C-alpha cells in the first residue's frame with residue numbers, strides 16, 4: 021500500500037555529474053565516456069562566434085576533486101560537447117531519448133557538479149517543467165531507467181518568469197518554443213494531462229479509494245467536449261488502449277472511469293481527497309502506476 | 319524558483335543494498351563494512367508471526383542458513399547476532415562501497431528519503447516524514463522489508479529507518495538501525511493499529527514561509543496570536559501543539575521573510591477556518607506538513623521574492 025511521487029534511483033547518474041567553469045560562469049556537466057555535455061550558454065548571443073575565440077584550456081572541468089583535461093570542443097544545437105582526456109569509469113549503459121509532453125522523468129538537481137536532490141516531474145503539454153531549481157542548477161539532467169539502461173531525456177537550461185523551467189534533450193534541441201538568450205519568453209497556457217489523471221484514478225482504485233466511481237459510462241466524443249472545457253488535453257484512442265491493463269485489473273472500463281472524471285470536473289471533490297490530494301494529479305503516467313503497483317527493480 | 323518534495327540522491331545507499339534469504343523468506347539488507355543489517359523477522363514463517371520467540375528461532379540457525387546476495391555475488395556469513403528487532407549478519411567481505419555513515423534515531427515531524435527495494439534491488443526513491451503517531455505513509459509492497467530511510471546532509475549518510483511492516487490502514491512501521499521500533503509497535507502479526515494521526519504544525523508553518531519566499535502572500539492577515547490561543551484553535555483541527563522549541567526553530571525563516579512566527583500562526587489559524595477558496599499554495603490545495611524548517615532552508619533561495 022501507499023502511493024508516492026517516486027523517482028528512479030539516481031546512483032547511475034550521480035557518477036556522471038561534473039562542474040564546468042568558463043570564465044565567470046559555473047554550471048553542471050554530464051560526463052559520459054570521454055565527453056562532457058553541458059548547456060552552451062556556459063560561454064556567455066552569437067554562440068559559434070563566441071566559441072571560436074575559446075581554447076580547450078579556457079574550459080575548467082572538475083569531477084569531484086580531480087580536474088579533467090579538455091582536449092576538444094564542439095557544439096550540437098544548444099549543447100556544448102567537451103572532449104576530455106579521461107573516459108568516465110562510472111559511465112553506465114545509456115541512451116539519449118527525446119520525450120513527449122505527458123511523459124515523466126527523474127531530475128537529479130545539481131550545483132557545482134554536486135548532486136543535491138532528486139525529484140520526479142513531467143514534461144507539461146506547454147513543454148515546460150514545474151521543477152525546483154536555483155541559480156547554478158543549469159546542466160542538471162532528467163532521466164528514466166529501463167532495467168540497467170539510463171535514458172537521458174532532459175538537460176536544464178533556464179527559468180521562465182512564472183517560475184517554471186525550460187531545457188533541451190541531450191542533443192541540444194529545446195523542448196518548446198524557447199531559446200537560450202536573455203529575451204522576453206513566456207510559457208504558453210498549460211493544460212492537464214488527461215491520460216495521466218485517469219491512470220492516477222486507477223491507482224486510487226487499486227489502493228482502495230472508490231468513492232468517485234459511478235454506474236455511468238460515456239463516449240470518447242462526449243468526454244472530449246468536457247475535457248476541452250476544463251483545459252484538459254484531448255484523450256485519444258491510443259490513450260484508451262494504453263489504459264487497457266489498468267482497466268482490466270480494476271474491472272472499470274476506460275470510458276466508465278472517464279464518466280467519473282467528468283463528474284469530478286463538473287462537481288468537484290466535495291471536501292474529499294483521492295490518494296491524499298484535493299486536486300486531480302496528472303504527473304503519473306499509466307506505466308508509472310503499473311510499475312509502482314508491481315515493484316519493478318533496477 | 320519552484321518547490322518540490324525532494325529526496326536525497328540515493329547512490330550512496332544503493333551500493334549498500336543486499337538480498338537476505340532465510341529458508342523461504344526473502345527481504346532486503348543493509349551492507350555496511352563487514353555487517354549486513356536486516357529485520358529479524360526474516361527467520362520467521364507466516365505461522366511464527368502470531369507469537370514468535372525470536373531467541374528460540376535464532377538459536378536453531380547456523381551461519382550457512384543465511385544466504386546473502388550482493389548483486390550477482392554470494393557473501394559468506396561468518397557470524398550472527400540479534401540487537402532488538404534487527405538481525406546483524408557478520409560477512410566475510412567488507413563493502414567497498416560503504417559510505418561515511420551514522421545511525422540516528424529521529425523524532426516525529428522529521429523527514430527522510432526512502433530507497434524502496436525488492437530482492438536487494440532498488441526500485442525507487444521518495445521523501446516522507448515520521449508521522450506524530452510514529453507511522454510513515456510510504457509506498458511499500460510485499461518484499462520491501464529491510465528498505466531504509468536516510469538523510470545525506472553534507473557527505474555523510476545518516477540511516478534513520480528500516481522498514482518492517484504494514485498496518486491495516488495501509489501505513490508503515492519500522493525501526494531505527496539499532497532495531498528499536500518507532501511507536502508502540504511489535505514485529506508480531508498481533509492486532510496493532512496506528513494511533514489517531516495529527517498534522518505536523520511546525521512543518522506547515524515552515525511550508526507557509528517557503529510560499530512567502532517564493533512570492534506568495536495571499537494567506538497572510540493583519541492579526542497576531544498568543545502561543546496558547548494558537549494551540550487552543552489548532553488542536554480543534556487535529557494539529558500538533560506548537561512548542562517554544564518550534565517557535566525558536568522557525569526564527570531564521572521569520573527573519574528572512576520579516577514575518578514573526580506568531581503572525582504566521584495567525585495566518586495558519588485563518589487558513590484552517592476559511593479553507594483556500596479555490597486557491598493553492600505552492601501548487602497544493604491542502605496544507606503540506608512533510609517539509610521541515612531545515613528542508614525549507616535547504617531547498618529555498620536565501621533571497622525572498
Ligand SMILES: O=C(Nc1cncc2ccccc12)[C@@H]1CNS(=O)(=O)c2ccc(Cl)cc21
Nearest residue numbers: 061153154155157177178179200201202319
Ligand atoms: O535562466 C537562467 N538560469 C536559471 C535556471 N534555473 C533556475 C534559476 C533561478 C534563478 C535564476 C536563474 C535560474 C539563466 C540566467 N537567467 S537569464 O539570463 O534570463 C537566462 C537566459 C537564457 C538561458 Cl538559457 C539561461 C539563463
Ligand SMILES: O=C(Nc1cncc2ccccc12)[C@@H]1CNS(=O)(=O)c2ccc(Cl)cc21
Nearest residue numbers: 021359367458459460482483484505506507
Ligand atoms: O507487514 C508485513 N509485510 C509488509 C511490509 N510492508 C508492506 C507490505 C505490503 C503488503 C504485504 C506485506 C507488506 C509482514 C507480513 N504481514 S504480517 O504478518 O502482518 C507482519 C507483521 C509484522 C511484521 Cl514485522 C511483518 C509482517
Ligand SMILES: [Cl-]
Nearest residue numbers: 423424425428
Ligand atoms: Cl530528529
